[PDB]
Structure 1
Amino acid sequence: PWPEARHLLNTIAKSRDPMKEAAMEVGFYVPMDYSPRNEEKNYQSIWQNEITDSQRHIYELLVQSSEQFNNSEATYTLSQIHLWSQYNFPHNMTLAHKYLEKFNDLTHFTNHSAIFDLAVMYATGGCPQDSAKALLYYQRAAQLGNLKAKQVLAYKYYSGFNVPRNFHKSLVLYRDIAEQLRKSYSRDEWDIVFPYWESYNVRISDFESGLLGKGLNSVPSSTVRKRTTRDASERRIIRIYYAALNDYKGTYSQSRNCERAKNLLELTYKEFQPHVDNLDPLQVFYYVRCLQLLGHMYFTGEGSSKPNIHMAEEILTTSLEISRRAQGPIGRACIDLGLINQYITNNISQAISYYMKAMKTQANNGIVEFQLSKLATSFPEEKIGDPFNLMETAYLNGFIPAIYEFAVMIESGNSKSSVENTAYLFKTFVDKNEAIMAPKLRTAFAALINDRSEVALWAYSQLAEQGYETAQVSAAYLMYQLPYEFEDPPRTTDQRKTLAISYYTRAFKQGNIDAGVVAGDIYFQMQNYSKAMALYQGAALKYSIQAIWNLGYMHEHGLGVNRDFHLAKRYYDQVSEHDHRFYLASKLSVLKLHLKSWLTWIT
């Protein structure tokens, strides 16, 4: 039956990601609690009133196909349907488990995708967990030649979680993964121009209030890009520059679109070119900025068929000419001039000149030093810096391939070649290329902005294990948020909490701070009172205000420590000392202390 089944399936448009459909021409809802009964009843309602008849036919045909016959190709795809919530069917977490089990049976440890997903599901206990089976499956899937499996094993051997810490085996895995990744990139994309892919590595809850209160949290909000911004004559070039940008580097809610940006830049260049000389005060600034942007779009080939080299060259040289007067910035322009006259034409001294011109500018990220050191190692007699220092500054600045090149250059040399630094470099690279390893962030966020909340928890969970911190704090936040005061705590099953605590804690040990405080609060709610102090003190050591104050409140009440009113006063003095705006609170709390004391003094 399956042939006609697939011919059916070819029509129904697996998933719609409004982040792209909103690119032709806000926020979301998270729940605070959960209930298995409510979920089952939601599912019954969805199957009762929402689905269409043709889909009824499709699904019954699928179950009969993958049931009567061990077709091994309705099983997998039906697993994928029920798990990733595609083809508009509901998300059923137990049916996906059953069918992935059946698949692994049929195919006898031959397919690594289902092995990976079964491993995640046996490690998070969503479906109790058992690390033994998880590690067995991870190893077995690493045998088959997967990537994510190798990453998760490497991380697990690096943060010391669930197995002893060992930098050396971690280093082996990471060097393996980095080598494969380098071999995945062509010669053009590597040296010349790095392909541009949006990241969704922004941790969630950076959109709503924030974590542990507004204006109170220590780690800086990380949403790098969202709707950049800042009566007729001036404002036109402003508005057009902002439309061009806001459709070049797409935001989180709406993806990017280059075609309209290219057409609009060409239009405005042709329409403004004849009478530029009258726009001296401020409009030449944004005008030349747009002009440089158009030139770069020509040189790259985005939003078109193929690059237009020579036209771009004239555009950039004229941009630089018009900028010579009015002393406008010359960064991207000179950088691309150098990139061109280094590979397009073979006149190098000018490239040296341009790089030296733009080195100190603001907009250079890493291209300058990288290309320059490759030159110097290819041409030693130029007397241009030193390979190590150049590449080092590059790595520090954040250019991707420079990370891996510098790490290789440091592996051959001592130059303080501790195992920690090498493991750290390679882990940063693997984590930060992000374009092949973890695209699932995109799928996740998309599934999030249209009311399918559960599947977002699933995807962010599967990402947790690989180590992308933002996945960790996001999945946590989706499982247990801090409750508003004078209000009941959430009503989730305890298993969810015993996972959320672990995700938060690992997030802490990774380098985040506030997650510690939220973990401590989860404990203090679940009534441990004992392990909390450790997290709180470790956070105090990293200057977390709400933490210190909370530690105070811990002391001056009978939990754990016993009524050491002196150190309590000391802690509140601290909270007032380290920062200012909390002055009143420290004071008034010492006042409550004084009142308790002087009142029990009377008896």
Structure 2
Amino acid sequence: PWPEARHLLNTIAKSRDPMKEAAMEPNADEFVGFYVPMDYSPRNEEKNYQSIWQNEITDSQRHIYELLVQSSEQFNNSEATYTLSQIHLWSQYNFPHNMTLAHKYLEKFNDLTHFTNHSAIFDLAVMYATGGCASGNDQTVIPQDSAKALLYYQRAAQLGNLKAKQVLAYKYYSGFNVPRNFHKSLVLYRDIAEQLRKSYSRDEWDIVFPYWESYNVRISDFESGLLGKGLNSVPSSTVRKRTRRIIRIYYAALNDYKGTYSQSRNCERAKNLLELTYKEFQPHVDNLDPLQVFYYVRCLQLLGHMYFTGEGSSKPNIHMAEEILTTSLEISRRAQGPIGRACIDLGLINQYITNNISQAISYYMKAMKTQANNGIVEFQLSKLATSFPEEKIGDPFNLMETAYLNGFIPAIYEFAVMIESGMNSKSSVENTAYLFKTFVDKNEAIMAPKLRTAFAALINDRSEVALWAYSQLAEQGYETAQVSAAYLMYQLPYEFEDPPRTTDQRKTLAISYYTRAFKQGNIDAGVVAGDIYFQMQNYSKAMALYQGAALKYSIQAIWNLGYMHEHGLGVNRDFHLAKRYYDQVSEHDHRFYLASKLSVLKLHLKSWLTWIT
């Protein structure tokens, strides 16, 4: 039965990505506010499943699905049962998802060699910790079970999977259910981090971090926001830079060198395009519009970084890089333009291909205040400080401390192993842990490569699988996944029409995600949690929550606060404090000057009537 099917699943060519398909082609360059549901309708998904598995499937595509499943039930293969979980849980080939049967077959895979394969036990160990999926109406449905999942996590990390021991460390570090226990968190964090540092090369560790494309972004920022407009915080989308022929080309290659969200990147067509430009312009180099040559030499900076990169080619060329960018500075003398990244990679290639350290300090130091310096320079210097104890440069400590904050990633590890090893007792113990996770969570490719899946396999269709993915990273320390999944589980109804028509369990999960996101910083989520409990009871819990938000300077919390005391369930009714709240909103913002005193108008309109009796 099976080994014939291997030819078929070879034939079908699944696990499709659209951004790779839009990398090459001319395209709309256009997407926003695409589509979402607001109600789940469990018994609707079953009939939709029925329709699609009736019609849109192919008769062959049934034929393959026929006998792996028919052969696996007749035969104990256990390889097809593992695949169909990854097919009805991932929708990896063109088939629907059904977490009931997927969950059902996962125990079958596990029982075959109970507790050996960490890649699977983890996946259902989440499924226990939710209770929302692997659910239904038949008998085997069970709600959430903490400990029964917890043990499986311990089995995986005991076996040695990474993100398991990650989520344990986060779970202690946050005080999710168990106590705080910073010590353990430190232990397994540093363990993880040494394994990560072992994943890389010496060369690749020291010279360039390889630019894995980032998706740790807070969905609902594409639309207005988690709430409204103007009264939000920190939109994390970073897309499609822009501010006279060539400049429209310049950006048009930059976007192709680092297209981040909706179109995959690679340099090759941008590169060929670029070298065409250098072969084109160079003899025709008079003045030529000092604003144009600006973007010319900027594309030269880029270009030299690309030859030294080795993108698109089989190898990098240090040499044509050398002539081309050294030329670039030969111009940059004239018009005194930006010079940074050329000074970096020039001071870097001299540092490992040649061995004139001396000038290399001159270049690094010549570009050190540059904005493009993230942390790379300092991290590269402190090496030479610890190697060559020379007075010229200062302490390694302060330099690496100037690289930590800026975001350059290797800087953390040295900055961490330093302080823990420090016979000099620096600030504390717990802060040390904050470093390690901040490294871990930021490497983002070994640990969390599925953000490129969840996003991707959302936009075509079928949010639910992305929802499971964020429901697999929300347990990790990724705020973005928490508010993402919750924003999929509960959208805010507009004031007019209607709240949703969803499950109560589902809300019991969403609220937990929003809460943890709140205590990772996103104040707005707190507000949203309160807007759940309007529809429920627990007005006291909500009041504590809102009140928890207001102390950190929000606004909507406050209007809800005065409004909760004036109308609805208040333990004591009072409008003295109320107008204070309603007025300090206008104290702080200066922009809602009217609605404050409007609330005052209705508030005294109460008094006019009540004096009648």
Alignment TM class, shorter chain as reference:
over 0.9
Structure 2: gaps of 5 or more residues:
26-32, 134-142
Q: Identify which of structures 1 and 2 has the higher relative contact order when contacts are C-alpha pairs closer than 8 Å and 6+ apart.
A: 1
Deviation at 1:417, TM superposition (A): 4.8
Q: Tell which deviates more after alignment, 251-260 or 273-282.
A: 273-282
Report if the CA contact (8 A) 2:266-2:311 is conserved: no
Counterparts of 2:213 and 2:252 in 1: how far apart (Å)? 18
Report if the CA contact (8 A) 2:527-2:557 is conserved: yes
**Structure 1 residues 223, 278: closer, same or farther in 2, change over 3 A?**
closer
Report if the CA contact (8 A) 1:292-1:316 is conserved: yes
**Structure 1 residues 225, 204: closer, same or farther in 2, change over 3 A?**
farther
Question: For 1:276-299, what per-residue CA distance to the aligned partner results, in whole angstroms no more than 9, with x for missing partners?
Answer: 223143111000001111110000
Match of 1:23, SS? helix
Deviation at 1:581, TM superposition (A): 1.0
Counterpart of 2:526 in structure 1 is 516
Question: For 1:24-79, what per-residue CA distance to the aligned partner results, in whole angstroms no more than 9, with x for missing partners?
Answer: 11x52111111111100100000111100111110011111221122110011111
Deviation at 1:322, TM superposition (A): 0.3
Counterpart of 2:405 in structure 1 is 396
Q: Tell which deviates more after alignment, 306-315 or 553-562.
A: 553-562
Confirm or deny that 1:143 pairs with 2:158: yes
Match of 1:397, SS? coil
Counterpart of 1:122 in structure 2 is 128
Deviation at 1:222, TM superposition (A): 4.3
TM-score for the superposition, normalised by structure 2:
0.95
Q: Tell which deviates more after alignment, 266-275 or 221-230.
A: 221-230
2:197 to 158, 178, 182: 182
**Structure 1 residues 94, 490: closer, same or farther in 2, change over 3 A?**
same
Question: For 1:160-198, what per-residue CA distance to the aligned partner results, in whole angstroms no more than 9, with x for missing partners?
Answer: 101111100100010110110001101111001110110
Counterparts of 2:391 and 2:57 in 1: how far apart (Å)? 70
Match of 2:284, SS? helix
Deviation at 1:218, TM superposition (A): 3.5
**Structure 1 residues 226, 602: closer, same or farther in 2, change over 3 A?**
farther
Deviation at 1:382, TM superposition (A): 4.5
**Structure 1 residues 583, 538: closer, same or farther in 2, change over 3 A?**
same
Deviation at 1:599, TM superposition (A): 1.2
Report if the CA contact (8 A) 2:217-2:236 is conserved: no
Q: Percent identity?
A: 100
1:479 to 489, 495, 499: 489
Question: For 1:427-456, what per-residue CA distance to the aligned partner results, in whole angstroms no more than 9, with x for missing partners?
Answer: 100011111100010010010110111111
Counterpart of 2:498 in structure 1 is 488
Q: Tell which deviates more after alignment, 437-446 or 276-285.
A: 276-285
**Structure 1 residues 99, 227: closer, same or farther in 2, change over 3 A?**
farther
Counterparts of 2:353 and 2:590 in 1: how far apart (Å)? 58
Match of 1:382, SS? coil
Match of 1:510, SS? coil
Counterparts of 2:568 and 2:38 in 1: how far apart (Å)? 31
Report if the CA contact (8 A) 2:218-2:235 is conserved: no
Report if the CA contact (8 A) 1:228-1:246 is conserved: no
Match of 2:112, SS? helix
Counterparts of 1:520 and 1:172 in 2: how far apart (Å)? 37
TM-score for the superposition, normalised by structure 1:
0.97
Q: Tell which deviates more after alignment, 519-528 or 391-400.
A: 519-528
Deviation at 1:387, TM superposition (A): 0.6
Deviation at 1:500, TM superposition (A): 0.4
Deviation at 1:342, TM superposition (A): 0.5
Structure 1: gaps of 5 or more residues:
231-236
1:416 to 403, 409, 426: 426
Question: For 1:143-174, what per-residue CA distance to the aligned partner results, in whole angstroms no more than 9, with x for missing partners?
Answer: 11100101000100100101111100100010
Counterparts of 1:299 and 1:219 in 2: how far apart (Å)? 34
Match of 1:549, SS? helix
Question: For 1:87-129, what per-residue CA distance to the aligned partner results, in whole angstroms no more than 9, with x for missing partners?
Answer: 1100111111001111111121110011110111010112311
Report if the CA contact (8 A) 2:240-2:255 is conserved: no
Report if the CA contact (8 A) 1:463-1:471 is conserved: yes
Counterparts of 2:174 and 2:550 in 1: how far apart (Å)? 22
Counterparts of 1:321 and 1:555 in 2: how far apart (Å)? 70
Match of 1:56, SS? helix
| Structure 1 vs Structure 2 CA RMSD | 1.5
Counterparts of 2:101 and 2:486 in 1: how far apart (Å)? 24
Report if the CA contact (8 A) 2:329-2:339 is conserved: yes
Report if the CA contact (8 A) 1:82-1:91 is conserved: yes
Counterparts of 2:299 and 2:86 in 1: how far apart (Å)? 45
Confirm or deny that 1:78 pairs with 2:93: no
Question: For 1:525-561, what per-residue CA distance to the aligned partner results, in whole angstroms no more than 9, with x for missing partners?
Answer: 2232110111111111111111111111111124134
1:373 to 370, 379, 382: 382
Report if the CA contact (8 A) 1:554-1:561 is conserved: no
Deviation at 1:587, TM superposition (A): 1.1
Q: Tell which deviates more after alignment, 509-518 or 213-222.
A: 213-222
Question: For 1:404-446, what per-residue CA distance to the aligned partner results, in whole angstroms no more than 9, with x for missing partners?
Answer: 1110111111342522111100010001111110001001001
Report if the CA contact (8 A) 1:365-1:397 is conserved: yes
Q: Tell which deviates more after alignment, 251-260 or 44-53.
A: 251-260
2:148 to 121, 125, 133: 133
Report if the CA contact (8 A) 2:244-2:292 is conserved: no
Question: For 1:345-396, what per-residue CA distance to the aligned partner results, in whole angstroms no more than 9, with x for missing partners?
Answer: 1110111000010001111111100000001111112521211100000011
Counterpart of 1:206 in structure 2 is 221
Counterparts of 2:109 and 2:493 in 1: how far apart (Å)? 41
Counterparts of 1:518 and 1:410 in 2: how far apart (Å)? 39
Counterparts of 1:467 and 1:506 in 2: how far apart (Å)? 9
Question: For 1:4-41, what per-residue CA distance to the aligned partner results, in whole angstroms no more than 9, with x for missing partners?
Answer: 0112111112221111110011x521111111111001
Q: Tell which deviates more after alignment, 554-563 or 396-405.
A: 554-563
Report if the CA contact (8 A) 1:226-1:251 is conserved: no
**Structure 1 residues 277, 322: closer, same or farther in 2, change over 3 A?**
same
Report if the CA contact (8 A) 2:216-2:451 is conserved: yes
Counterparts of 1:278 and 1:140 in 2: how far apart (Å)? 68
Report if the CA contact (8 A) 1:219-1:513 is conserved: no
Counterparts of 1:222 and 1:419 in 2: how far apart (Å)? 34
Q: Tell which deviates more after alignment, 526-535 or 289-298.
A: 526-535
Question: For 1:228-271, what per-residue CA distance to the aligned partner results, in whole angstroms no more than 9, with x for missing partners?
Answer: 899xxxxxx11110111010011311111210111011000110
Match of 1:247, SS? helix
Match of 1:217, SS? coil
Counterparts of 2:82 and 2:242 in 1: how far apart (Å)? 40
